[PDB]
C-alpha cells in the first residue's frame, strides 16, 4: 500500500510553490513509490510572524509534515524573518531547512535545535579569509565587527580558526550598530601596526564604516580590506572604497535550485530513514499535542549525515550546527568602481580566475601588509630617579661622577605632592633607562615610559568575578596591557613566572639587612628567631619579600613578626633605621647596598639569601623578549653592566666598620 508522507514549506511566491511540488514529484518518481510516496504542501510568506506561526500549526502541521522548508520573503522585514518557524517546528522537533537564511544566529543548536540550512552563515565566510590570509602570508590583521550575535559569531569563528595556529588576536574592534560616526575607533585602529583589515557589518552600518574610513584615508594602499557579502551590496556598494576584496555566495539569491536539492536530500534522508524501525508519524495538527515527536531528532541525525554529494547547488554535507559545509563563494573586486570576479572559491581551496589582482589605490600587484612600547616603572632610588621637568623645560644637564652628561626621559606617574593624586608628567633618569635606550639603539623599538599609579610593583589580591582584579601594580598593568613591557628593579620568581615571560637577569642580588654601624649573624638570625617587641624588624607589606614569607611554609611562622610595623615605601623604610625608629630593615641588596654606600651610617650585614636576579617583564606571547634576553647577554659579555653599576653605585665613602 502507498503511504503519503507530507512535507511542508514556506516560500516567496506561488510559482516557487509549483517548483517545490515539481521537485517533490521528481523525488517520488525516482524512488520507490510502492513502499512510500512523498506529498508536498506549502504557503506564501505572511505579513507578521504570528500569521505564519499560526499557518505552520494550522495549515502545515495539520498535514503531518515530516519537515519544513523556509525561504526569505520578497521584502525582508527586519532580519531573520524565518525566526518563528525554527521555534514552532522546534517544539515538536520537526526538522526545518532554510534556503535563503544566511543569518548566523541560527547556528547555535541551543536556541534553534531543529535548524538546518543549504547555505553557510556569514560567519563561515571566515573560512575564506583564513585561507586568503594563508596564501598571502599575512598573519597580522585587524577585525572590525558590529556588536550582535552575527559579528561576535564571526569573531569567534575566525579566532577559532586561528586557535589551531598560535592564537592571533592582532587586534579586534567592536562597534555597536546604527552608529553614524565611527571615527574614534578607526583612529585607534591606525595605531595598530597590522595594515590589513577585515570587517563584518550590515549594509547601512558598512556605509558609515567606509564613510568614516575614507575620512582617515584608510582606504589607501598599504591597507587591505576583506569583507562579507552584505558589505559589498546595497547602499554600501555606493560608498565602498576601491580595490576592496569581497565575497558573494553562489546561488544565494535563488531559492529554486536550493529547493530541488533540499527536497532531493529530504527524499534521500526519508528513504534512508524508513530503513529504520520504531518510527512514528509527526503529530497530527497542533491542537491537543503537548508532546515532542521522538523521531524528529533522528530524522535530523540522518539528514545531517545524508551525503548525496551530487546536487544542483554543489557539494552537500552538514557541520555540527546543521550549517552547510563545503559551499562555494565567488570573490569580487571593486575595479573601476564596479564588481568583477578576480577569482572564485569552491571547496576548501581557493581558485584564481584569470583576472588581474586589484588592491586599494593603484597596484598592478601589491600584496603589502603589517611601533611603540609603553614602559612602566616604580620609584626605586638606585635604578630610578624622579624629578619634575622644570616648568615646560625638560631635563637637567647634570653630570655623572665620571664626566658624562646624565641622560633622562619623561615619565607619567603618581604624585603625592598634590593632596589628590594626579597622574603627573615627570622626568625620570636611571640605570634601567640607560639600559632601555641602549636597547633602543640596539633594537628597532621606540619607547614611551610612564610610572605605574600604584607604588607597589605588584601582588595578587582582592576577590574575583567577571571583571577579575588581578595582582595590583605595574605587573598588573603588563597583563592588562597598560604597559606592554616592564622596566624596573624586579626580582624574578616562579609565582609570577607562570603568568609572564622574564628577561635574562641584568643584575644578580639577594636579600639582606640594614642596621646602623655606629657603636645580624645570618639570614637565619637567632635575634630574628628570638623576636622582640623591643627589637623591631621591618619590611614593606606587598613587597615580594612578603610573598616569600607567605608562599614559603618552612619559615611561615617567622613571617608574622615581620608583618608587624610594616612600612609603605623604600624611602620611609630606610628612614626608620636612619631615624632609629626601627633597629633593622630587610630588603634585596641591589636597592640596599647603594644606600649603604650613600650613608655609611648604616650597614648591610650577612650573606645575600633568596639569591635572585632582576629582569625586564614581558608577556610570554610577545617574541621581543627573545631578543631582549639575547641583547641582555650581549650587554653582559662586554662589561656594559659592570660599567653601569660602576657609574650608578658610587662606592665613595664607607668601609667594614669593625
Amino acid at each position: 500500500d502507498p503511504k503519503i508522507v507530507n512535507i511542508g514549506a514556506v516560500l516567496s511566491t506561488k510559482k516557487h510553490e509549483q517548483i517545490f511540488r515539481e521537485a517533490v514529484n521528481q523525488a517520488n518518481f525516482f524512488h520507490f513509490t510502492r513502499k512510500i510516496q512523498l506529498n508536498a504542501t506549502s504557503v506564501t510568506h505572511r505579513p507578521n510572524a504570528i500569521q505564519m506561526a499560526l499557518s505552520v500549526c494550522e495549515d502545515l502541521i495539520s498535514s503531518q509534515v515530516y519537515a519544513i522548508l523556509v525561504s526569505h520573503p520578497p521584502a525582508p522585514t527586519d532580519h531573520l524573518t524565518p525566526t518563528p518557524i525554527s521555534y514552532t517546528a522546534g517544539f515538536y522537533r520537526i526538522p526545518v531547512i532554510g534556503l535563503t537564511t544566511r543569518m548566523s544566529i541560527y547556528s547555535d543548536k541551543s536556541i534553534h535545535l531543529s535548524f538546518l540550512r543549504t547555505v553557510p552563515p556569514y560567519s563561515h565566510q571566515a573560512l575564506v579569509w583564513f585561507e586568503m590570509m594563508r596564501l598571502f602570508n599575512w598573519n597580522h590583521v585587524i577585525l572590525i565587527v558590529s556588536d550582535d550575535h552575527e559579528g561576535r559569531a564571526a569573531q569567534k569563528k575566525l579566532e577559532t580558526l586561528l586557535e589551531e595556529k598560535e592564537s592571533k588576536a592582532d587586534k579586534v574592534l567592536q562597534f555597536e550598530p546604527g552608529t553614524k560616526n565611527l571615527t574614534a575607533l578607526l583612529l585607534e585602529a591606525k595605531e595598530l601596526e597590522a595594515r590589513v583589515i577585515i570587517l563584518s557589518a550590515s549594509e547601512d552600518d558598512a556605509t558609515a564604516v567606509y564613510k568614516s574610513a575614507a575620512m582617515l584615508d584608510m582606504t589607501g594602499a598599504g591597507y587591505v580590506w576583506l569583507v562579507g557579502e552584505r558589505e559589498i551590496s546595497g547602499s554600501a556598494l555606493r560608498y565602498a572604497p576601491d580595490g576592496i576584496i569581497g565575497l558573494q555566495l553562489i546561488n544565494g539569491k535563488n531559492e529554486s535550485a536550493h529547493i530541488s536539492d533540499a527536497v532531493a536530500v529530504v527524499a534521500q534522508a526519508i528513504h534512508e530513514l524508513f530503513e529504520m524501525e520504531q518510527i512514528t508519524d509527526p503529530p497530527r495538527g497542533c491542537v491537543g499535542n503537548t508532546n515532542i515527536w521522538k523521531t524528529g531528532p533522528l530524522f535530523k541525525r540522518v539528514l545531517m549525515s545524508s551525503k548525496y554529494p551530487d546536487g544542483v547547488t554543489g557539494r552537500i554535507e552538514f557541520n555540527e550546527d546543521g550549517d552547510r559545509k563545503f559551499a562555494q563563494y565567488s570573490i569580487m573586486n571593486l575595479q573601476n568602481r564596479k564588481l568583477v570576479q578576480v577569482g572564485i572559491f569552491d571547496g576548501s581551496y581557493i581558485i584564481q580566475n584569470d583576472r588581474k589582482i586589484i588592491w586599494p589605490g593603484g597596484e598592478t600587484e601589491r600584496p603589502q601588509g603589517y611601533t611603540r612600547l609603553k614602559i612602566v616603572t616604580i620609584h626605586q632610588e638606585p635604578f630610578v630617579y624622579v624629578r619634575p621637568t622644570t616648568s615646560d623645560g625638560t631635563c637637567r644637564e647634570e653630570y655623572t661622577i665620571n664626566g658624562d652628561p646624565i641622560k633622562k626621559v619623561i615619565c607619567n606617574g603618581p604624585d603625592e605632592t598634590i593632596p589628590g593624586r594626579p597622574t603627573v608628567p615627570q622626568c625620570c633618569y636611571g640605570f634601567c633607562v640607560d639600559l632601555l635606550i641602549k636597547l633602543a639603539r640596539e633594537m628597532d623599538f621606540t619607547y614611551e615610559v610612564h610610572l605605574v599609579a600604584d607604588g607597589k610593583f605588584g601582588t595578587q589580591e582582592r576577590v574575583n568575578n567577571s571583571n577579575a582584579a588581578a595582582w595590583n601594580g605595574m605587573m598588573g598593568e603588563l597583563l592588562s596591557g597598560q604597559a606592554d613591557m616592564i622596566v624596573a628593579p624586579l626580582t624574578i620568581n616562579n609565582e609570577r613566572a607562570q603568568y609572564i615571560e622574564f628577561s635574562k637577569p641584568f643584575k644578580y642580588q639577594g636579600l639582606t639587612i640594614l642596621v646602623k654601624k655606629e657603636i645580624i649573624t645570618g639570614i637565619n638570625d637567632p635575634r630574628l628567631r628570638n623576636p622582640s617587641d623591643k627589637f623591631i624588624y621591618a619590611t614593606v607589606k606587598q613587597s615580594s619579600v612578603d610573598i616569600y614569607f607567605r608562599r614559603q611554609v618552612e619559615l611561615s611562622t617567622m613571617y608574622r613578626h615581620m608583618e608587624k610595623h610594616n612600612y609603605e615605601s623604600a624611602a620611609e623604610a630606610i628612614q626608620a633605621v636612619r631615624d632609629n625608629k626601627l633597629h633593622a630593615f630587610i630588603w634585596d641588596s641591589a636597592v640596599l647596598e647603594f644606600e649603604a654606600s650613600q650613608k655609611c651610617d648604616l650597614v648591610t650585614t650577612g650573606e645575600l639569601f633568596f639569591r635572585s636576579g632582576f629582569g625586564i617583564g614581558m608577556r610570554k606571547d610577545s617574541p621581543w623578549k627573545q631578543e631582549v634576553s639575547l641583547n641582555i647577554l650581549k650587554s653582559h659579555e662586554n662589561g656594559f653592566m659592570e660599567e653601569l653599576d660602576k657609574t650608578w653605585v658610587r662606592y665613595q665613602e664607607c668601609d667594614s666598620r669593625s
Partner: protein
C-alpha cells in the same frame, strides 16, 4: 479622570474542568491610583496554536495592557512561547507557576517577559551553598545544550573562583539531545567521570533519559550524589522513578503561598508598575492589544515601563527582577526525594543566606578507614625503651607497648607523647613496634635499611623517632613538618678547616660520629676526607661515644643537635657543653615518615602545629627536653 487599567489572567490545568474562576482580583490596596479591570479565562492543555490564538483572541479590541500566565504543567517550552508573543506585542507578560516559571533562553532586551522562577545564576549559587554546607568540595557538571548552558557554566565558574577552599571541578559535559543516540554517546562519556557530586542541567524530559543511562552506567549509587536545578523537578507533582532516590534539588514552595496568592502578587506588580509610571508621567499605560495588525502607536514608548517594572514592592514584599526577567530573590526551598516518591523539603533559602535542617550523614567507619602499624627506635635521649614491671605484667602510665622481634618492651618519651596527642586529635588507633635491621634507615650499595625499609615494604605506614630529614628520604617518602629545632652539632669540654685536616695541626686531633647516620651519609656526600678520616673515630653507641669523650682519649664529639643540647643540659657534672651558641649548620628538624603522595598527609601536618598552637610543646620541652646544666646561663 478615572484611570481603570485593563488586565487579563489565565490558568491552565488546576486538575479541574471548572478550574477555580476569578478566585482573586477582589479589591485590595485600592488606594493605588489605577484600578484593575480583569478578564479571566482558562484553557485545559497547552499548545502553541491554542495559546497564541487565545491570547490574541482576548486581545481583540479589548486592548489589555498586561497578562499573567499560570499552568499545572511541567512543560519547559511554554514560557518561551508567551515570551515570543510579548516580543511581538510589547505587552507585558509574566508567569507564576510551573513551566512559565521554569527558566528560558536569555530574553530579548526589547521584549518584555518575566518569571517567578529563580535566576539560573541564583540557582547555581544555591547549589553551591548546598555543597559547601555538606562540605562536598569536589564535583563535576553534566549539562545539555538547552538554553542557559554557559550562563550556568560561567556562573559556576565565577562563584567557584572567588572562594578560598580548594574545591575541584573535575569535568564539564555538553551533549546534544538532538542527534539522539544509537551510540549511547552520553553513556560513553558519563561512564568516564569519577567525581562524587554531580550537577546536572537539562529539560525535564532529558533528565529522564540521562538518568536511565546513569542507571546503566552505575552513576546513581553508593556515595555519588546528584544535585539539580528548578527545571527537572518542575511542578514536583509528578516524578518518574527513573530519577534516582537521594536526588537533591531546589524549587519554589506551594505550601508557603498558594497559587492564587502568587497571582495576586502578579496583578499587584502590574498595577504597581502602572501606578509608578502614572506618578512619573501622569499617563495611561493602556494600549491597543490586537496582535494581527501593526503594534499600536506609542506602544513603542512602552520601554520605560519595563524600566519601571523591574523592581516592584507591595505587602512588605520585594518583587525586584533581574535584567533577564527572573525575580531577583524569590524565597526558595531545598528539596530532596524522600524514599519512595516523596518530595520532602530539607532546606529554606532566602536573599543572601541559606538555612538547612539535617545535621549529619544526610541520606567500617564512615568518616575514614583502615589501620596503621608504626615502627620506632630507642633514642639515648628521646624515644625511651623501658622494661615493664614483671609483677604488673603490662605497661604503666604514659608508657605505650612496643614489640621487638628477636618480647614486649615499653616505649615512652617525646615520640610517644607527640604521637599520642596526634592520635587523640586525628582520632585513629595504631600498633607500635621496634625495628630490627639497621635502626634508622641505612644504605649499603643499592638497598635501603631500617624503619624506612618497613615503610617501603608497607610493613609500616608511618615511622616515628629521632629520625632526621634529608633530600633522599623526602624523595622516597613524604615527611611531616619539623617539630623541633635540631641538626648536626658538636659537644666538647672546655668552617675553620681545623676539621678539614687534622694533619695541619701537629698533634693529632680527634672527632667522631655514630655510623649509619644521616650525619655520616651527609658527611660522605659533601666532605669525603672528613669521613675517611673519622671512620677510625666512629663509636658504637651514644653512651659509648660519650665514654670516648668523658674519660678522655677523644677530644670532640659530633651528633644530632637536640640530643647534644639535652645532653648539654643533662650531665653527671657540667663537664660537657655545645659549640658556640649551639647554632647548627644543616639546620633541620625531626620529621615523620608516610608512604607517598597518597596518605592522610596534610591532616597530620595541621595536627602538629596545633600542638604548638596551644603551647603544649613548651611544656613538653620543659619536662622532657630541659636539662639542669646550662645553669649559669
Amino acid at each position: 479622570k478615572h484611570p481603570n487599567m485593563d488586565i487579563a489572567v489565565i490558568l491552565v490545568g488546576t486538575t479541574e474542568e471548572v478550574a477555580i474562576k476569578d478566585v482573586h482580583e477582589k479589591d485590595d490596596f485600592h488606594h493605588l491610583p489605577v484600578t484593575p479591570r480583569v478578564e479571566l479565562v482558562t484553557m485545559q492543555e497547552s499548545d502553541p496554536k491554542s495559546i497564541i490564538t487565545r491570547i490574541c483572541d482576548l486581545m481583540s479590541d479589548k486592548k489589555v495592557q498586561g497578562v499573567v500566565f499560570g499552568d499545572d504543567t511541567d512543560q519547559e517550552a511554554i514560557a518561551q512561547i508567551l515570551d515570543f508573543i510579548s516580543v511581538q506585542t510589547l505587552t507585558p507578560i509574566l508567569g507564576i507557576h510551573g513551566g512559565s516559571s521554569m527558566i528560558m533562553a536569555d530574553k530579548e532586551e526589547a521584549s518584555m517577559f518575566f518569571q517567578f522562577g529563580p535566576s539560573i545564576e541564583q540557582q547555581a549559587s544555591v547549589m553551591l551553598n548546598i555543597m559547601e554546607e555538606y562540605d562536598w568540595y569536589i564535583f563535576s557538571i553534566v549539562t545539555t545544550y538547552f538554553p542557559g548552558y554557559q550562563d550556568f557554566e560561567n556562573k559556576v565558574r565565577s562563584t567557584i573562583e572567588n572562594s578560598f577552599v580548594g574545591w575541584e571541578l573535575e569535568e564539564v559535559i555538553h551533549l546534544d539531545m538532538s542527534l539522539d543516540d544509537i551510540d549511547s554517546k552520553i553513556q560513553n562519556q558519563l561512564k568516564k567521570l569519577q567525581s562524587p557530586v554531580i550537577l546536572l542541567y537539562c529539560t525535564k524530559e532529558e533528565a529522564t533519559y540521562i538518568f536511565e543511562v546513569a542507571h546503566s552506567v552505575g552513576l546513581t549509587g553508593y556515595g555519588f550524589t546528584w544535585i539539580v536545578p528548578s527545571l527537572v523537578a518542575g511542578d514536583t507533582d509528578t516524578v518518574p522513578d527513573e530519577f534516582p532516590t537521594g536526588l537533591i534539588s531546589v524549587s519554589y514552595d506551594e505550601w508557603d503561598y498558594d497559587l492564587p496568592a502568587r497571582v495576586r502578587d502578579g496583578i499587584a506588580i502590574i498595577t504597581t508598575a502602572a501606578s509608578t509610571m502614572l506618578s512619573e508621567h501622569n499617563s495611561i499605560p493602556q494600549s491597543k492589544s490586537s496582535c494581527n495588525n501593526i503594534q499600536e502607536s506609542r506602544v513603542y514608548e512602552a520601554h520605560m515601563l519595563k524600566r519601571y517594572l523591574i523592581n516592584v514592592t507591595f505587602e512588605g514584599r520585594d518583587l525586584s527582577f533581574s535584567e533577564d526577567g527572573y525575580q531577583m530573590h524569590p524565597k526558595l526551598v531545598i528539596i530532596l526525594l524522600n524514599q519512595e516518591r516523596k518530595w520532602e523539603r530539607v532546606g529554606k533559602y532566602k536573599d543572601r543566606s541559606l538555612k538547612m535542617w539535617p545535621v549529619f550523614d544526610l541520606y567500617s567507619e564512615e568518616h575514614k578507614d583502615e589501620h596503621l602499624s608504626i615502627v620506632t627506635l630507642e633514642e639515648a635521649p628521646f624515644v625511651i625503651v623501658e622494661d615493664v614491671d614483671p609483677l604488673s605484667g603490662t605497661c604503666m602510665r604514659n608508657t605505650v607497648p612496643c614489640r621487638k622481634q628477636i618480647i614486649k618492651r615499653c616505649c615512652k618519651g617525646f615520640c610517644i607523647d607527640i604521637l599520642k596527642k596526634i592520635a587523640k586529635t586525628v582520632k585513629f588507633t595504631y600498633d607500635l613496634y621496634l625495628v630490627t635491621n639497621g635502626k634508622h634507615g641505612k644504605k649499603i650499595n643499592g638497598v635501603w635499611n631500617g624503619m624506612i625499609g618497613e615503610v617501603v615494604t608497607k610493613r609500616a605506614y608511618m615511622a616515628v623517632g629521632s629520625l632526621t630529614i634529608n633530600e633522599e628520604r623526602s624523595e622516597v617518602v613524604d615527611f611531616s613538618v619539623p617539630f623541633i629545632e635540631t641538626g648536626i652539632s658538636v659537644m666538647v669540654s672546655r668552617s675553620d678547616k681545623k676539621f678539614q685536616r687534622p694533619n695541619d695541626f701537629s698533634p693529632a686531633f680527634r672527632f667522631g660520629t655514630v655510623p649509619n647516620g644521616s650525619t655520616e651519609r651527609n658527611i660522605r656526600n659533601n666532605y669525603l676526607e672528613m669521613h675517611s678520616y673519622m671512620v677510625k673515630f666512629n663509636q658504637r653507641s651514644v653512651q659509648d661515644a660519650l665514654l670516648s669523650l668523658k674519660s678522655g682519649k677523644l677530644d670532640a664529639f659530633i651528633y644530632d643537635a637536640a640530643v647534644l643540647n639535652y645532653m648539654a643540659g643533662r650531665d653527671e657534672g657540667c663537664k660537657l657543653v655545645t659549640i658556640g651558641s649551639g647554632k647548627v649548620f644543616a639546620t633541620t628538624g625531626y620529621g615523620i615518615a608516610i608512604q607517598k603522595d597518597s596518605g592522610w598527609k596534610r591532616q597530620v601536618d595541621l595536627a602538629i602545629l596545633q600542638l604548638f598552637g596551644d603551647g603544649e610543646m613548651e611544656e613538653l620541652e620543659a619536662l622532657w627536653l630541659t636539662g639542669i646544666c646550662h645553669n649559669e646561663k
